[PDB]
Amino acid sequence: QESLSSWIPENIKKKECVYFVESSKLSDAGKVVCQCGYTHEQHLEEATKPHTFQGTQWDPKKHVQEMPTDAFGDIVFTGLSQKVKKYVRVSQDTPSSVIYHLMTQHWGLDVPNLLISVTGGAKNFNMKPRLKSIFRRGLVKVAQTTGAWIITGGSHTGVMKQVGEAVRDFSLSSSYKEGELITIGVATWGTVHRREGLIHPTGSFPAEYILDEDGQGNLTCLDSNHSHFILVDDGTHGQYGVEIPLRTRLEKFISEQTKERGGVAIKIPIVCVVLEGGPGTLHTIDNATTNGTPCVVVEGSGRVADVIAQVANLPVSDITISLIQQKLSVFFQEMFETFTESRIVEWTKKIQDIVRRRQLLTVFREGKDGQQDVDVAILQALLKASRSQDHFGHENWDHQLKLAVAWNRVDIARSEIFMDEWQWKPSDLHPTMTAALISNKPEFVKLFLENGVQLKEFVTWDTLLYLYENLDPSCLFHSKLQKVLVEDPERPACAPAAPRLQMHHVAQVLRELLGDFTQPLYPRPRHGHVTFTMDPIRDLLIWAIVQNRRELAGIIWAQSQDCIAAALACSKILKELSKEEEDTDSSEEMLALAEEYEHRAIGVFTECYRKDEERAQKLLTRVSEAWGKTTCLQLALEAKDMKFVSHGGIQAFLTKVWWGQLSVDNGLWRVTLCMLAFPLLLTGLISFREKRLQDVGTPAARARAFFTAPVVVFHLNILSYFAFLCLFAYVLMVDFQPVPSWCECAIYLWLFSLVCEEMRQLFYDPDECGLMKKAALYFSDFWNKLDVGAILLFVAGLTCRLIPATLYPGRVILSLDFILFCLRLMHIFTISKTLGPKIIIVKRMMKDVFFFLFLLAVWVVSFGVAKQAILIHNERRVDWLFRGAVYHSYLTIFGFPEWLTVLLLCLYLLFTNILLLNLLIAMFNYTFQQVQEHTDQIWKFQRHDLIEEYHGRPAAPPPFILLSHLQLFIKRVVLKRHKQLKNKLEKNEEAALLSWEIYLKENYLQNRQFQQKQRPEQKIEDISNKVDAMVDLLDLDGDSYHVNARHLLYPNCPVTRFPVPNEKVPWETEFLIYDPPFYTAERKDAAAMDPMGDTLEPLSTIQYNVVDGLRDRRSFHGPYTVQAGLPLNPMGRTGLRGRGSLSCFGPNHTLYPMVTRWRRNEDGAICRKSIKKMLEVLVVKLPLSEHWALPGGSREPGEMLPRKLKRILRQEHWPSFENLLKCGMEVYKGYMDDPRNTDNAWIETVAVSVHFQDQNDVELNRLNSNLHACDSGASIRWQVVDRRIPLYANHKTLLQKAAAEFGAHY
């Protein structure tokens, strides 16, 4: 950091008045002030010495000097904030490269994307509330998204205070958000209140500045919200306006000289904006607009804004100096009388020179019906300015569109950027696609899709990684991903602490969100140009669906690959996610989205069922390779997809599985009768489908296929279980002995067979899963719980019967076992049509009848202890009185002594016969009211797993299931679902199936959107848009002067000239206030040029409009008038008397040659524009001109005036040969407009044009070899010609005049 504190006194300077030139007008209590009077009795910070000449009116160029700067550093305001702010005091003239290097390196500010420079009224500013509203939302909203750089004046007063407050509260209300809208303020060092505390000679790395709004006379104090501060010094003290040229010069160098990413350059766009102002504002706008930054003014705002906005669409000649003060004094009605005529003519000149350049200006218009934003204005003010500034620029085409993404302006970007003239390739829209996605903008991604971006080519692997790196941090999924990634333990060695984000991490959280049964989606690498995944659009759908982005996901579902899996997976994820949300507004939308996706899955499948049913059944049993090797049906099962499974065709598929190999329509009684007899099935007793078994009767195959059906195995297990119960009841009633019988041992054998069947029910693993999770999914089952409780009670009872000493214990234990088996048979009635729905309600009401019965138990216990205490003697018996009163309480609960008996019986009658019955009535009303009619769908959803469990089971009744257990146990001793519920199809088959599917989806979508067009709200919206188009359709029913001469800021000479309007230009019109300074250059009293810059002496005697020897002082146009022995401009008035930097008075004759040639293609034919052709000129660029210009020289020598342009450029001896070849064609001669024109010393030219018609070998060969170009110049090169090509505008007039001689384009 100390490199900065060493670097600033090395680098930057600051101004110093060195001599006491005591002011005539003594200041207000500053009577000792030497025309600046900074800090002394003098204007001196040293000895106010004579310095060998006490020069009266000490020149700011000559008196004031530069000194190394030490006043830099950091700052904090005393108690007003807590953060620190950087600040630098800087010289008046400083190279902007220095300041940019400072702000980049030693302050740590990266390159921006937008530069808003806001300007307005400082001390006397008043605003209506409507104007105040735009600053709070419009400026902050457009600043905060793009990552702007708000640059403004640093002051606590007026508009800068409004920007300072409106950016502060955003930082507080952001709730610890990352990033701050960076703000840089620039003010003059002279008009600072307490800056004497700021000057520290060493590096003031801490500092304290206390603001005080009391001592503000001439000066003003800083604002406390700006994040960086720049203080331009001038050496003066109370001057206002030494910050405008530095800000304007710096803004351009930042915008157009720093970003060159893949090409020549790319300019960071830049907008100046105004609110309300005065004389500082007009000078700022006028100095800005000459540098190419556009300016938007806001209507209905203030004084200067309205007087600019009224004169917007007016022609330039229509401005009258009367009209200016007329419109001025009404809006400036407070200080309207404070205006003088010189101020009126200055403001008229400035408003004239501003509204000339109609490209670089826009009005906001204050449309005030929507009062939309600043953004709609700023975008058009970018686009009009960008086209005019350059036509070959490509940075604006891709840099601008991205900005147009971030404010959601699709009509603008469609109409303006996507008209023509870009010639883009589609893949070039890839990065600006990405930020349209992260910022959740559906309209722009729909427009990019309709313009031709391919999703399947777009989603690379690293692109997907970057997509997951920038999730919305407000969502739940981001918090869960962070809780996983922070708890990621296997990342030991890296440069940082937080390692990375890998795809297996989000795969790992997705597997835990989705369920155990799927495989991991993304693999972990066990370790190019473009790495692709197995299916791209799946991944983008997952990303867009975890963040609850609705309208984005609805778009990208339409391009999906295999849709019925996709809609169900996205329903499952949303239902599993909406439970853990814990926000009362997110959960409702996150649920309704899942319901909509259930609707989409049903809508596609009901089409594919109607087209071809038997192919559509193959769609459910497919195993999807995309979603982690699962099927569609199990995915719909786990998501509780209630409305999906109750569809007709899927229930038909379930029934067709259920009736097995044989047909589905032969009823149940015939099934029982063929179950009764073996050869009745061998007779023509039953049905069959797949008639090769029905016609060709092979009775062994028919018996095997009859026994394979799961209904048969169901009825066989029911019959065997029934006989098991009956013989168990007989051996429990009378046949019980301490010695085991034989009817007993057979029954124990059948129950061992049952427990081994339940063992293989638990241990079966078709796919690998959690074995503990396998046990959990087992024990979650109700009937599994009942079955295992029965078998544990049975083995405990057999242990007790093995004890002969507890026989009557053990025997009755085997009674209770029996009771459990009875409820098992109620399981049968789940398969009925009409009973199962009732069983559902019983399983419902168990849950609360339990917790009611506990309360009943506490009540009857209280009653029993009360009755035992009131109505007995004092007794502690073991089982006489306690069991007697317990039997009396059982007789009461199952169904003088006068007053006490009446009180006891009435208390019992009022309590235990009344109120808890009403609790039951209310609780079971609240229970049975809730069930409603959903119960049929609950049963239809409940139908599946029974068919599953019986399909997996072997065929034998359980006395013979050991015959099945032995073969399977010896096959799994040595070393897979059935292929009717999950099968991996042929690849060649699956391609045809998926193509059929993706055909049918587009047929669904048209009916969907078409019937969505018939809702009434859509019709009302369409009628309103119709009538608004109707009301729009029904509502639908200058003087050419030397304007480059009158322009201010005489080049390379810091002087000024007088404001001259469009009225008082020529010598015919009288201008009574016309008093131009007799201005001469420093080199106007010099060598071979005429010494008549000070021609008040009689030295002015040279020839006027005649050749005074070598000085051909005679115009090509005509004879100039002479007044007071000096020539006047024949064109009019310029505003500056004298010679200037020109050689002599009158015209200074010069020759401007131009070379022209044709621009050929790769073949050699002429390249073609829309109509005309392409032209090339050879131009020069000097090292300190920063501009291309024509190689034209002053015609002070005769023939070597092109060599006076191009002795060092062209050649030495071959230059005279090409000068002999320079006999060409003349286009224009005479007076030329130029900024180096006074009223006396103007420029006249002759313009010759030489040409190359053939672009092979001829005259051009001599131009090639005769080139020694590298003499004292930077660069020369040939160049394409177009109207936007860089050059001096004066030379651009020559090219636009000489382009008609060959028919090139424009």
Ligand X SMILES: Nc1ncnc2c1ncn2[C@@H]1O[C@H](COP(=O)(O)OP(=O)(O)OC[C@H]2O[C@@H](O)[C@H](O)[C@@H]2O)[C@@H](O)[C@H]1O
Residue 1148, annotated ligand binder?
Answer: no
Q: Would you count residue 535 as binding ligand X (CB under 6 A)?
A: no
Query: How far is Cα 1068 from Cα 1097, in angstroms, rounded to an integer?
Result: 28
Does the annotation place 1185 within a ligand binding site? Answer: yes
Question: Minimum CB separation from ligand X for residue 361, in Å?
Answer: 18
C-alpha distance from residue 531 to each of 460, 465, 625 (Å): 6, 12, 19
Partner that binds at residue 1034, options its own copies, ligand X, none, CB closer than 5 to 8 Å by kind? its own copies
1182 binds ligand X (CB under 6 A): yes
Pick the stretch among 277-285, 326-334, 388-396, 814-822 that binds ligand X (CB under 6 A). 277-285
291 near ligand X, rule: CB under 6 A: no
890 is in an annotated binding site: no
Q: Is 1068 annotated as a binding residue?
A: no
CB-nearer residue toward ligand X: 166 or 594? 166
Q: Of ligand X, its own copies, none, which one sits near residue 279, judging by CB under 5 to 8 A according to partner kind?
A: ligand X
Angle of CA points 994, 999, 1001, to nearest 5°: 95
Partner from its own copies, ligand X, none binding residue 220, C-beta < 5-8 Å depending on class: ligand X
- C-alpha count within 13 angstroms, C-beta hemisphere, residue 1114: 8
1080 annotated as belonging to a binding site for a ligand: no
Give the residue closest to ligand X by C-beta.
Answer: 278
If one asks whether residue 153 binds ligand X (CB under 6 A), the answer comes out as: yes
Residue number, 176 or 742, with CB nearest to its own copies? 176
Judged by CB under 6 A, the residue of 123, 500, 773, 1026 near ligand X is 123
To its own copies, the closest distance from the beta carbon of 172 in angstroms equals 10
1184 is in an annotated binding site: yes
Between residue 1050 and residue 1069, which ones bind ligand X under the rule CB under 6 A? Answer: 1051-1052
Measured from the CB atom, the residue of 237 and 1236 that comes closer to ligand X is: 1236
**353's tokens:** 């020179």
59/1035 with CB nearer its own copies: 1035
Amino acid of residue 691: K
In the beta sheet, which residues pair with residue 199? none
Residues 6+ apart with CB under 8 A from 849: none
With both helix axes pointing from N to C terminus, report the angle between 395-406 and 430-438 in degrees, rounded to the nearest 10.
Answer: 10
Cα–Cα dist 265/1093, whole Å: 43
Q: What is the DSSP string of 565-610?
A: HHHHHHHHHHHHHTTS---TTHHHHHHHHHHHHHHHHHHHHHHHHH
Answer yes or no: is 524 a known binding residue: no
- Quick one: three-class SS letters along 333-378? CCCHHHCCHHHHHHHHHHHHHHHHCCCCEEECCCCCCCCCCCHHHH
- CB of 1003 or CB of 1185, closer to ligand X: 1185
157 in contact with ligand X (CB under 6 A): yes
CB-CB neighbours of 851 under 10 Å: 9
CA 850 centroid distance within chain: 55
Using CB under 8 A as the criterion, which residues of the chain lie in contact with its own copies when the complex forms?
173, 175-176, 585, 606, 611-612, 615, 1019, 1022-1024, 1026-1031, 1033-1035
Residue type for position 1146:
G
Identify which range of 34-42, 273-281, 724-732, 1150-1158 contacts ligand X by CB under 6 A: 273-281
Binding segment (CB under 6 A) for ligand X, from list 113-121, 168-176, 725-733, 1169-1177: 113-121
- How far apart, in whole angstroms, are the C-alpha atoms of residue 1161 and residue 1109? 50
- Closest CB to ligand X among residues 332, 1004: 332
Q: Select 1028 or 1301, whichever has its Cβ closest to its own copies.
A: 1028
Check binding of 281 to ligand X (CB under 6 A). Answer: yes
* CA distance linking residue 1073 with residue 395, whole number of Å: 48
Structure tokens at 295: 């300016």
Per CB under 6 A, 278 contacts ligand X: yes
Residue 1290 annotated in ligand binding: yes
Which of the choices its own copies, ligand X, none does residue 612 contact, using the CB cut-off of 5 to 8 A by kind?
Answer: its own copies
On whether 281 is known to bind a ligand per the annotation, the reply is yes
Sequence positions preceding breaks in the chain, C–N over 2.5 Å: 527, 895, 975, 1037
Out of 37, 121, 442, 836, the residue judged to bind ligand X by CB under 6 A: 121
Please state the closest distance from residue 989 (CB atom) to its own copies, in A: 50
CB-neighbour burial class of residue 57 (10 A; exposed 0-12, middle 13-18, buried 19+): exposed
Count interface residues toward ligand X (CB under 6 A): 29
According to DSSP H, which parts of 780-835 are helical?
Answer: 782-802, 807-826
Binding mask 736-775 for ligand X (x = CB under 6 A): ----------------------------------------
Helix axes 771-779, 742-763, angle to 10 degrees: 120
Cα 863 off chain centre by? 71
Reduce the DSSP state of residue 439 to 3 states and report it: coil
Long-range contact set of residues 702-709: C-beta below 8 Å, sequence gap at least 24: 705/660, 705/661, 705/662, 706/661, 706/662, 706/674, 706/681, 707/955, 708/660, 708/661, 708/955, 709/659, 709/660, 709/661, 709/662
Choosing from 284, 301, 518, 1240, the residue that interacts with ligand X (CB under 6 A) is 284
CB of 1035 to its own copies, least distance (A): 7
Phi first, then psi, for residue 1027 (nearest 5°) are -75, -25
For residue 1138, the minimal CB distance to ligand X (Å) is: 16
What is the residue type of 706?
F
User: Could you say which of its own copies, ligand X, none residue 900 binds, taking C-beta under 5 to 8 angstroms by partner kind?
Assistant: none
Residue 737, amino acid: Q
For the bound state, the minimum distance from the C-beta of residue 165 to its own copies, rounded and expressed in Å, comes to: 18
Cβ nearer to ligand X, comparing 143 with 285: 285
Q: What does the per-residue mask of binding to ligand X show for 220-249, with x meaning CB under 6 A?
A: x-------------------x--x------
- The DSSP 8-state label assigned to residue 1103 in this structure reads P
DSSP 824-854: HHHGGGGSSSSSHHHHHHHHHHHHHHHHHHH
Residue 243 interacting partner from its own copies, ligand X, none (CB closer than 5 to 8 Å by kind) = ligand X
Which residues line the annotated binding site?
Answer: 119, 124, 247, 278, 281, 758, 761, 784, 949, 1184-1185, 1234, 1236, 1288, 1290
Residues contributing to the site for ligand X (CB under 6 A): 119-125, 153, 155, 157, 187, 220, 240, 243, 277-281, 284, 1051-1052, 1182, 1184-1185, 1234, 1236, 1288, 1290
